[PDB]
Each structure stands twice: as C-alpha cells, then as structure tokens.
Design an enzyme around this catalytic site. Structure first.
Site, short mmCIF file in Angstrom:
data_model
loop_
_atom_site.label_atom_id
_atom_site.label_comp_id
_atom_site.label_asym_id
_atom_site.label_seq_id
_atom_site.Cartn_x
_atom_site.Cartn_y
_atom_site.Cartn_z
N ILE A 35 0.92 -1.16 0.21
CA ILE A 35 0.16 0.10 -0.08
C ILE A 35 0.88 1.28 0.08
O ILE A 35 0.42 2.06 -0.51
CB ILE A 35 -0.91 0.10 1.24
N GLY A 36 2.03 1.12 0.72
CA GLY A 36 2.90 2.37 0.54
C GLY A 36 4.32 2.14 1.18
O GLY A 36 4.71 1.01 1.99
N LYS A 37 5.11 3.15 1.13
CA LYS A 37 6.55 2.84 1.64
C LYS A 37 6.70 3.94 2.54
O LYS A 37 5.91 4.84 2.99
CB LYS A 37 7.43 2.78 0.69
N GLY A 38 8.22 4.09 3.04
CA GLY A 38 8.52 5.29 3.71
C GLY A 38 9.87 4.79 4.66
O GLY A 38 10.46 3.69 4.04
N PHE A 94 10.49 3.90 7.58
CA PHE A 94 10.44 2.63 8.20
C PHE A 94 10.30 1.42 7.15
O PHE A 94 11.16 0.33 7.80
CB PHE A 94 9.00 2.59 9.03
N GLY A 95 9.63 1.16 6.29
CA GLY A 95 9.68 -0.04 5.68
C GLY A 95 8.41 -0.10 4.78
O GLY A 95 8.35 0.98 3.78
N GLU A 96 7.41 -0.90 4.60
CA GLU A 96 6.40 -0.91 3.83
C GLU A 96 5.08 -1.23 4.68
O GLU A 96 5.18 -1.85 5.62
CB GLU A 96 6.52 -1.92 2.76
N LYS A 100 2.43 -2.94 8.99
CA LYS A 100 3.45 -2.15 8.58
C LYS A 100 4.50 -3.07 8.90
O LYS A 100 5.07 -3.49 9.99
CB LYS A 100 3.71 -0.87 9.49
N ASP A 151 7.00 14.61 13.01
CA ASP A 151 6.84 14.37 11.86
C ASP A 151 5.61 14.42 11.09
O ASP A 151 5.33 13.36 10.30
CB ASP A 151 7.80 12.91 11.47
#
EC number: 2.7.11.30
Lengths: 324, 330, 330, 330, 330
Positions: free
Chosen positions: C41-44, C46-48, C62, C163
């Site tokens: 669904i998404g990244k960042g 942190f991870g995925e 997550k 953040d």
C-alpha cells in the site's frame, strides 16, 4: 529486552512508571552480560571503572575484584533496597555476578558521564561564577537528598571528595561511590555500621577519633566538612576576569601527597588550620556566599556546621538572584 | 544469599522491613546449612547450644536431639508465628531440619552473647548495685513483654515462659539480659479465650517450680496461673542476683535457690515438702537492709514468693518499680 | 483466539474493556502470524505498509526492515505503554517479531482505511467546504489529543509527533482523519519533567521541518518546542487541504508545501534559506477570502507559520475555533 | 507439616487466624493419608465413623462408601466453601480422596469427642437440670448459627440441616453439644434467592420428619420451609433430653420420639398416620411441671410441634429464651 | 470436578461467588466432554439441540455445524462476557470445542426444559387466562432485561435479540418462559455509542421481521431501531399465545403469525407486501373482548404492531402493565 529497545527507554520506564524500584533482575543480568567494554576510566579501592556500551549507547561499568565483594554488595544493596534515585546522584542501572570462587566477577552498571570526576574537570577547566554555582548547588542538592529521611532512610556518604563526584554535560554534579555509606532507620534508631575514607578529607572528629559513632548525626556532619573542602576546590577555579588560582587539593600546602592520619590530625586538629580562603573571593556576592558556607562547614565542632539542606537552600537562593 | 552479604545486612533488612516477619525460609535454610560450628556452649533438656560462625560473624546454634523434635518446633513456632522480637529476648535468626527418621537434625539459630547464661555470669562474677539493677530490670522488661498481649496485626498473644531460671537467661555485653528458651511457652488468645499447651502436664526445672505447680493445685484453665508461676521463679532469680551484689567487698558465694534445703537435681517431692509444707523460701540476708536497692529487691522477692499466686506482683509492676529505683542512680 | 472469533469482536472487547488494556501479547502474536497479506500500500523510512486480511477482515500491516528496529519498537512502545486510543489516531491492533539476526521480521498491525493517506486522497479528489472542515477539525482533534497530558490511571503523557504531514495522515470512509506513524514521537512526564528521546538530532521530513528546527535554534530541553513544531507542519497540511476545497468548480491542483520554492526531496539547507532567511511561507490564494470557512482556515495557517514558535496557536485552540466554524453549518 | 508439629498447633493456627478459613489441601491430604485408624465408632447412611490418631493425638474419621460420594462431597463442600466454624458445630479438619472407580476412598476428618452422640450419651446417663440446659442451649446455639445468614466476608449463607436428631449431635467433655453431619444440608443465597439443591425428593430419618415433610405438603420453594422442619425435629430432641433430666432420682428411661406409636425403622406411611392424621406428638410427662426449667422446655417443645410450620419458634428465639433460663442460674 | 459433585453445585457456585460470569473454562470443558447425549430435541440454522445428561442430571446441548462457527462463538461470547444471567433467559452453563478443520465440533450447554419451545408447548396445549399471563409476563420480563443497560461492572450492555419467536422461547415446569438463542444478538455500549454488530444486513426469521426491516428502511445506526423490531415480533408471539387461551372450551387452533396471508417459509418479498404494502397484521379475534386479560393483551399487540417503530411500546412498559394485570387476578 526486545529488538530496538534502547538504554534510554529502559531508564525512562523505571524512572516514571517504575515506582521507585529499578529494572528487573533478569533485565539487569541481560544488560550486564551483553555490554561491550571499551576501555578503563579509573581505579580505586573497589576495582576499576570502565566505559562500556550497551547496544551502542555509552554506560559506565565498575568491575570489582573478587576480594572486594563486600563493597560490591554494599553499594548495590544501598541503591536497590533504598530506591535512592536523584538528579544529583550517580544513576544506578544494574548489578550482576558471574563465575565461582576465586574468579567470581562482580559488576555494577550506571550512567556514563564523559566529563569524568569533578577532580578531573577542575584540573582541565576554570569556571564561570554561574558555573561554580551550578556545581556547588547540585552537589549540595545530592548530599541533601542522601541525608534526608523519608520512603528511604537517611544515608551518610562517609567518603565525599572531588574524585567521587561526577560532572554532567549540563555542568551539574552527582555524588558517586556509596560503598562506605551508612544507613539510619529512625523508626528503630539503628545504623548498619572503623574510621574509613580518604585521609585528606577526614573531618576533625574523625581524625582525633573523638567522633561519637552512636549518633547518626556525627556522620552527616563529617560529610558537610568534606563537602566544604570540595566547594573550596571549586571556587578556586572560578575565573572572574581571567583571574583564578591553579587547581589544588585541600591542604595541598600543609601536607604530603597521600597524607597519613597523623600528618592530617596535626594540621587540622592541633594547629587548627583550614584551607586558605583567598582575599579576592570578597570580590562578588557569589564568591562571598561560598566563602561563608565553607567557614560554616569547617567548624571544629560538628554540631555547629551547616546542614546539607541549609546549604542547598541558601545556594539555591544565590542562584535565582543570578537568573541562572 | 549473594556474595558480600553479611549477617548485619540480613538482620537489618528483616528489622527494618514492613513485616514483623523474619527471613525467608530459603534464606534461613541457606544460613543454617552454611554455618560453621566452633564448639559447644551448653546443654539442657532440648540438646546442645553451640557457638557458630556464618561467614565469619558469630552466632548461636541450638542443636536438638531427634527425640526432642516437639521442643524444636514449639520454640520456632512461637518465634516465627507471632513475629516476636524484643531487646530483652534472645534474638531468633533461623530454624532448619536435615536428615530422616532416627538421624533427623533439628537446628535453631540466634544471636551470640559471649557472656553466656546469667547462671554462668553470676558464678564468674559479683556485681555493682547498678549492675544488679540492670540485670533485674532487663529481665523484668523481657518477662513483661512476653506476658503482654497486643491485640491487632503486628500484635502478639500473651505468652507464659513456664521455665524461667538463671540458666535460661543470657547477659549481653552491655550488662543487660534477655530471656531464652521458649520451648515450653504457652500462648493465650484473649479474643477466643484459648490456651495452647504442648506439654500439658507439669514441666520445667523442679528447683524453680512454683508452689501451686508442686502440690499440683494450679488451675491450668486460667492463663494467669502460668504468668504467676513465672513471677515466683523470677523472684528466685532476683535472689541469685542480689546475693552477688558486692557492696564494699561484702557478698555471698553464688548459690542456686534452695541450695541448702534440697539435693542437687531435686525431686518433685523433695521440693514440695520444703516449699509447700515447711513453707520455706530462700533466706533473705540481713545485710540486704543496707542500701535502698537491696531493700527494694528484697521487697519484690517476698511479693513474688507468696504461696498464693494471685497475691504476687506482676511483671509490669516489677518493671515499673525497678525502673524507678534505676532512675535515681547513675 | 478460538473458532468463530472475528476482528470486530477483538476490537470491541479491548474498546469496551473497562481496564484500559489492548490485546494480550499471545493474541497479538497469533493475529500477526495468522494474517494473510494482500499487497503493498505504501512505503517510507520505516519499511512498507501492506493491506492484509485476518480471517477475511481487512487490516493494515507495517513491515519494518531489520535495520529499522528502533522505529518499530519506538512506535509500538508509545502505543502500548500509553493506551493511546483515539478516534482521530490510527488504531493500533498488534505488534510482533519473528526471525533472528539479519532476517528478523518486525510487524505492526492496525485498522485498515481503504482511502489511504490524506496525500493520496487530496491528489485523487477535491472537497466540499464541509468536507474541508471535517478533515481539518479531525486532524486538529487528534494532534490535540496527542499533545494533551492527562494525569490518572487511564491517563496519558503528552506526546509530540515530530513528523506530521499529509502522508502520515489517513482518511476514513466518513471523511475524517487520523494521525499515524508515531515512530519519532516524544513523551513528556510532567510529574518528573522528563523527555523520552533524551539526546536527539533533527528528524522528520525536511519539507515540513519548522523554522526553529531548520536553523537549529530550537530548544530541545523544553517539551513545548516540539508541540510548536507540530503546529507549524499541521499548518502546511491545512494549506494542502484548502487548496483542493472546490467552491463552484474553482480549485487549485494538488501541491506539496513549498512546491515552487524548492526541488523534490529538499535539502536541510535549501529549506532553511526559503523558510528561515527569505522568510517565505506557502502562498495563501486571494480567492480564499471568498467564504467564511476559507478565511478561518487562512487565519489559522498564518497563526501557525509564525517564525517564533511560542507565538503559534495551540492544537486545542485550533480544534476549538475549527469546531466552532463546523458548528456554524451543522 | 514439619517434624514436631502437633494437631493442637494446626487447629490453633487456623482458629487464631483472621482468615477464618482452614488448612491447605496439601496439608489436609497429608494429615488424612498419615492418620492411623484405631477402631470403629459408629455407622449411618454415609458409611462409618472411626476413631483415629494423627501423630498420637485423637481424631475422628468418617469413611464413606464409594456409592455415597455425593454425601461426602456435599458435607465437605458446605464446611470448606462456607468457612463454617462454631463452638457448637462439629469441627472440620480435612477432606481427602484416594483410589479410582469402584474403590475410590472418600474421607472427612474432624475433632474427636469421646462422649459420642447425644443419643449414646442419654442412653448411658441421666442429667442435672443444669446439665439439661447446657445441652439444649448449646444445640439451639448451633442450629441458630447454621440458620443465620451473614453478609460480611467472615459471613455465610443460611443453612438448613435437614436431618437433626440425637444421633447427629455430639457431646463434649464440658457437657456441651455440637451439631454434626451436614451431608443433606441446604444453602440459601438471599442476594439471589436461590437454593443449593434439587429438593426433587424427600430426605432424612423418617422418625424425625416434620408433618409438612411426611404428607409432602411442604413448599420447597421457600427456604423457610426447611428451617421450620429443623425446629420440629430439634423439639423431638429436646424431648429426648428432658426425659432424662433426673430431679430427685425421678426420671424416665431413654426413649426415641414416637417409640410407643411406631415400629423400629418407621415407614413414611406409619409416621404420616401418627403425626399428620392422628395429630399425635410425644407425650409431655406430668411431672415436667415440677420446676421452671422443665416447664420452659415443655413450652418450647409444644411451640416446635405445631402442625403449621410458620407457627413454630425460631432457632434464635429458642436460643434466647433458653439463654435466659440459663443465666438465671449460670 | 471431583466425586460427588452435582450440576446443582456447579450452577450454585457460579451464581453465588464465582466472580467470572460463569464456571472456569477447565470445568466447562470437563462438563462438556463428559456429558452423555440422549437424543435430539430440535434443529435450526445453527445446528441441533440435544437433551443430554451430566452425571445423571439432565441438560441441553446445542451442537453446531462446523460451518456455523460464528454463531457458536457469538452466542457464547455474549453470554460469558457479561454475566448475563436472568430468570427469563435460557441459563448458560458451558461452551467447548473439540476436533480440527472440517470436523471441528462446537458445543454449548444449558439448562434443560422438558417442555421445549413455546411453539411446541402451544401446539400441545391450550391455556388458562392466568397461564397466558405467566407466559407473556415472563417473556416480556426477559426481553426487558436484555434491552436494559446497566452501567456498573456488575452491570451489562443493552442487547437486542434480533430473532424473537415462539420457537426461540422455552417454557419451564412452572409455566414461565425464558428467551433463548443469542446468536444474532447485538450489543450497545452507551459510553461509546458503539453498536457491536454480528451480521450487518437483515437477519432473522422472515415471518417475524418487522416492517422497517422488510422494506429495509430501518436505521441501523440507532440501537433503538433493533429494540423496536424486537417488540414487533414479541407482539406476534403474544398473538400466538392468546390464540390458545381457552376460556370455557372456546379457543383457536395453534397458528403461526400470518399463517393465512403467506406460504410456509415466506420470502422477504412475500412478507413485505403483506406487512409493508397491504399494511396487514394478524387478525385480533372478536371474542378477545370477552375478559380484561384478553383485552389488555389485544391492546399491547396493537401498540406493538405500529408501522412506525418509535411509536411502539417498550419491553419495560409491557412488563409493567402486564405485571399489573397479573396482580388483578393473583
């Protein structure tokens, strides 16, 4: 301790929810046996102090010699049993043991202060009038907390000195080394007890041996006398307009390195001498307040000296008037 | 018990703990099985008392004979159960057991007092008028505390010793005393008016048995009967003490009560004749009229030796008047 | 977890649980290791984030990279130890770990919101004046709750996000929002005046970093400093929102704050020049003077962008005035 | 249960404990499996009662027949769960089980009373007017305590015996009594208005069954019904007692109630005819008008034998008036 | 569970002290896996209900089909999670599971009522005016208790049955009723205004579905909607009851509601036309104007059948007025 856990997290948890008490023995063990020693930082009767890292974060590790097990226990005992935590007292983290017989390995773990002891700090630097206040106030705050009975029993250090005090990043202090400390349970008027400690800082009553070790107060008083000698070492390096003395231990001019009980007794008890309070110290308010305290700490009669809480109070006053 | 731990630490912790309870059984066990016996110190019906050391520090160890298990349990029970603890009562430290059947080894551990029993102390010394007061006062203080009931939590039931004597009393470095040996002791729960007796029949050293006890006319249904018998014997003890109170070099030789009216190891019958029938009591020396102290003491002794128990002084009473005499000295 | 149990049941129980606890570790573990991943669904950093299903019901997972274990712990730690539960905060369900060393697998599980992040939502849609209020109000409500300190059992320390941004905010089916990603969050125990992350550097997405943070003049000794930096970024978010508030077909294209004054993936320096030096802020369109709503919003944005943090509005403040505006229309 | 421990010690400890409760199952087990049976003392529907010794001290052991497990459990259940202890109620000590299936061995352990049951006692003796009062008062005190409900934690539910009789009562050394055998007892939780059994039957010794019980007109929906039946039987017991109250050598021979109107081991029908139909009750001797005591008793007996239960005296009532008669002459 | 333990004992214990709403899981398991099935008693969507015995005593066992695990859990969940125990609600005893995958065996255990469902009862009998009141009053009492919310921890949430009908009601020996089958029940936590829903679409027996439910105009956001639908069906049930209230030999034959306007196993559409469109309700017989009782009932039925739910009577209301009528007879 799971993945990602940091020393900070641990400390924060015992500090808040912890309810006085510290980390679980199993956690202390794990931390201890999982620390990575860097190198030595100092020695003493006990053993050696090392700078170590736990998962990257720095920490201090005091490693005792098998034959000094009593000091190891005694100090850990006073820390844990009492839940004696305070901004101005070296922060205990964990205790642990490892081998058998002859090779038993006894460790203690605490916060790490890169600045080292007040002794090293003063030899390396000179300080602001504000700086001097910070150090003296903090030291008094800690000794006040140790002597204070609550809950927790009253405790007498019995070996105060610039080398047993550490200075933090924020120019504050924290007492350290409770291996000789004595406890007093008022509700029973008992004290788990023999003159000990660094000769150079031994109080008068202690030197001539006229001290009454039946009254816990005697010990609190001897602590103040030495704390006075420390304030002296501090003010000496309080540079106002480039003017300041060179670092010097108390009685550096009246007695040899590693003074004997007798050499000290003659200068302190007989000759009734005290460290020389410089003339210039009349310069500013701060230096005067300090010089004042020092005198009211050096009285030959202990019951005449100021109390830790007293000094904390008047020194706390001088601080607000300075906008510190 | 980890490295560096010392006896002091242990004692301090139980002493300054929330519970009047003592050390954890596991700790008691460890102490016991890790003590190092030095040598014997004395005997008795129970077994033997030894001087032992735990990690260097001295301590007393009472080792019972397998066949005396009831005394071992009874005494340990009384100590632990009610968190008994008092300046003038031998300080209990631990209890433990070891083998099986015939060779079962039963131990009890307590503070060590280098002076030994009052009996030994009096045989070895003579004492100051002040000294005499210290001993008698302390002894009374202890017996007072034992007999005293304190209703509530950290309270204790009333307790009757049932075997007081100079040999069951110990003297400390500071010339004070502490009762010892609670193996025959009896408890009384007022809130239930119940009295527990392990050795229901007459017990204790014949020589100190009270009159009611000797003729067997004592009513063991009333707890008071026991407290009273305790006083009578405590009187005999005060006698043994004053006898050695030397004022100006003058003092008698140590002697047990009734040393001149009955053989060593008196029989219940020999004693009954002299105490019950002949209505005799230890001879109260004439010189004891010398000073105030000696008189006060002689006074008490008489008010302790009454044939009728209900007529005798109480421990708290003696503690009070003896505490008074003390105030006006030193 | 037994047969027939559904996610709803679990959530309902912890929610309705009088005792402010989340699920038992054993249950969390079971849920985690029994989930069935659908797709990413998404990244960042942190991870995925993945969309997964637990016994059919959807849920978000997550998955952190082994080397990002600190973020995993930190976030789970803040959620669990605090009970932090709020309508406008991503709902935590479980945390779990799996392998060893290099391949350790760290997971976190939460509610699933098919709409995704506010960022995606705004890029995909335009919104009603009412819609805009819903989003802004909710977001403020959540940030308010995070910053709010509460002393008591079911109480929580104050928390600063550190953040905030359209990509860390999720939008629900009912057009509401919920803050997410507490990996950098900081706690404050007032009763001890102590922080969480003691020695900290400058963290968070550059594009949203506050002025004090950029020039590094911020005082990380005062917890308030952090709350304030949060507001500044929340302002940039309100900006991204209002921009897509279409009144009569008129609306701007979605754009990140400072999209015209700095390159994609701005550097700390590029940002500092535009924000600190040139003292620039996102351009507040002229048309936004049209209606009351657009004005109230523009007002807040300015009182959020002040160079001096202590001058900015508080989360509770914005929640209040925004709650008012939303009240002036039902 | 370490070495030296005695039964007395155990009892004393549970007794003098604010817990108000009893021994740990492990201790009960150990006592039970370590007892040494002497010989039989009596029988009954349950099984047999034996006199046994635990480490020398005497104790009673009720050994049930495998097929009577329900009685075993029921009685132990009422004792333990309820925390039932009272001077006038047989003192419960322990419960235990041993084999499997067919040979399962179920035991119950209690205090031992060398006098045996009231039934045996009356057959063996005659009694003082004072003696008679002691027995009747105590019995009433116990039945009163059973029927009494208490809300505090040290309290219990109301309990109906359902099988009172001279054979289920024991007499102590001090001429007092204590009810025994709670195998058929019924509990009542007022706070829920619920009963402890499935009264779907009729139980107890026929000879003492109350009228409502015999004709089966009793309403087992109202707990009171049971309390009342208990009184009727307690009356029959007072009858058996007064009959042996010898004043000046004059006294009747021991006799069970209705000994002259029905055969040994009466049938439900034989009893119903004499009690329900013929409306007959034990004959109250003429001489019983002699003294106050005998009259008071005769009075009670009548106010216990009413055909209508709701008309009968209550246990507390009898305890009160009997306590009065008693206090007039200690 | 030890020897001699009986079902009564178990129930009494949970009812009384047992803090957890009911018996310990280990005990539930043992009971379940130690029951002995007799034969089938009925079926339903869930599975089958059997009459079984636990150590002789009768009990009901609902055995679910593997594919119906959600109903099993849901019902057990509602029972255990709240202590829900009421005179007029089928008494829950235990829940248990056994195999794996395909053959998993899910059970539920409760009290046994030899009379069966109200449906069977009415088909087998006719009833007194008093009898009719008993049944209607009890049923209302139970539905009242289910709908009632209680805020303490000794309290519970409001619950809507969602599938009331003569077949889900059981009749006891004393001619009283108790609701049963909570598999579709819905919970409402007022303190959070959250509707814990099982299947969020229309569920339940078509024949009894309320108007709002049939046309699908019901607002499932307001918990009240559900309470109201329950009343409408409870009205249909009162109808089935009064129909069999024989006064002087005159009474109708048992018939399900709408038995003459729609086929067996009605479709959602067939029902909607007769109930929503044609606005038809069961025919209220003319003779029901005979006595007070029949009128009161007919009154309620009408005030239950309103097309507008908010217009209908409440369970507590009906309980009250029906409780009144009950007292006008005895």
């Amino acid at each position: 301790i799971s993945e990602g856990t940091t020393l900070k997290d641990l400390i924060y948890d015992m500090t808040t929810s912890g309810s006085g008490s510290g980390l679980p023995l199993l956690v202390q063990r794990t931390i201890a046996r999982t620390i990575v020693l860097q190198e030595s930082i100092g020695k003493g009767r006990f053993g050696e102090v090392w700078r170590g890292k736990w998962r990257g974060e720095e920490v201090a590790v005091k490693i005792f010699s098998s034959r000094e097990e009593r000091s190891w226990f005694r100090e850990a005992e006073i820390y844990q049993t009492v839940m004696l935590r305070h901004e101005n007292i070296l922060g205990f983290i964990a205790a642990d043991n490892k081998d058998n017989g002859t090779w038993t390995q006894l460790w203690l773990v605490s916060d790490y202060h890169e600045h080292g002891s007040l002794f090293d700090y003063l030899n390396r630097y000179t300080v602001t009038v504000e700086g001097m206040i910070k150090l003296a106030l903090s030291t008094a705050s800690g000794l006040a907390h140790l002597h204070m009975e609550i809950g927790k029993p009253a405790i007498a250090h019995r070996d105060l000195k610039s080398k047993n005090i550490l200075v933090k990043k924020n120019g504050t202090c924290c007492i350290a080394d409770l291996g000789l400390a004595v406890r007093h349970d008022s509700a029973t008027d008992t004290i788990d007890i023999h003159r000990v400690g660094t000769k150079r800082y031994m109080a008068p009553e202690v030197l001539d041996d006229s001290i009454n070790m039946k009254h816990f107060e005697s010990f609190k008083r001897a602590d103040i006398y030495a704390m006075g000698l420390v304030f002296w070492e501090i003010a000496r390096r309080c540079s106002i307009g480039g003017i300041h003395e060179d670092y010097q231990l108390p009685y550096y001019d009246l007695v040899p390195s590693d003074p004997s009980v007798e050499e000290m007794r003659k200068v302190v008890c007989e000759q009734k001498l005290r460290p020389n309070i410089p003339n210039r110290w009349q310069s500013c308010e701060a230096l005067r307040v300090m010089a004042k305290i020092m005198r009211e700490c050096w009285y030959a009669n202990g019951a005449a000296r100021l109390t830790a809480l007293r000094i904390k109070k008047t020194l706390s006053q001088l601080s607000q008037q300075e906008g510190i």
